[PDB]
């Protein structure tokens, strides 16, 4: 039994050339009249999965 990947996390995050992951940003699908132009534009970027989340989930993406 090969360890299976988490096929729902491969659709979300990628791996960079340091061993760390490149997630997208939440709160960006609807209800946009309830956010500042700053808060809407600040969310358009992307960020890295924090060290705590590299704790919970690091073997769920071992091939990715």
């Amino acid at each position: 039994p090969k360890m299976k990947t988490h096929r729902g996390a491969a659709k979300r995050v990628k791996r960079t050339a340091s061993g760390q992951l490149k997630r997208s940003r939440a709160f960006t699908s609807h209800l946009f009249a309830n956010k500042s132009t700053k808060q809407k534009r600040q969310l358009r970027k992307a960020r890295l999965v924090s060290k705590s989340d590299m704790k919970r989930v690091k073997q769920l993406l071992a091939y990715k």
Binding site: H6, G8, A9, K11, R12, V13, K14, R23, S24, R25, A26, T28, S29, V49, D53, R56, V57, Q59, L60
Partner: protein, 125 residues
Amino acid sequence: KLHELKPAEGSRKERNRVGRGVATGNGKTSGRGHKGQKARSGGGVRPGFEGGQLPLFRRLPKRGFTNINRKEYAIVNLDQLNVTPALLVESGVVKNEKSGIKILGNGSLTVKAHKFSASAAEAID
């Protein structure tokens, strides 16, 4: 010599063996602490579960698609070159032509290839 064998100093270790006495340190509970869902044979919650709080990788939006016709190449720099694609394979450079040998421009210095970086096509001439 077969009756005096010696593995290299530092290679082997004897395994840890729990649940045998209380002078080893891992005897009574065997390294599991007291009662709980994780002190039970059958493991804890599945990894990434997080307890009921919606986990991370189900709380972030999906992203992108994947192209069927992705043409990834074999990257050669101009330091590898200090020239058919085959000779570049039969020297020990391109151990697999994924799509084709593309020549890049990192390093210093004729070439048959399938593409070229800008720096490469400049610094080859």
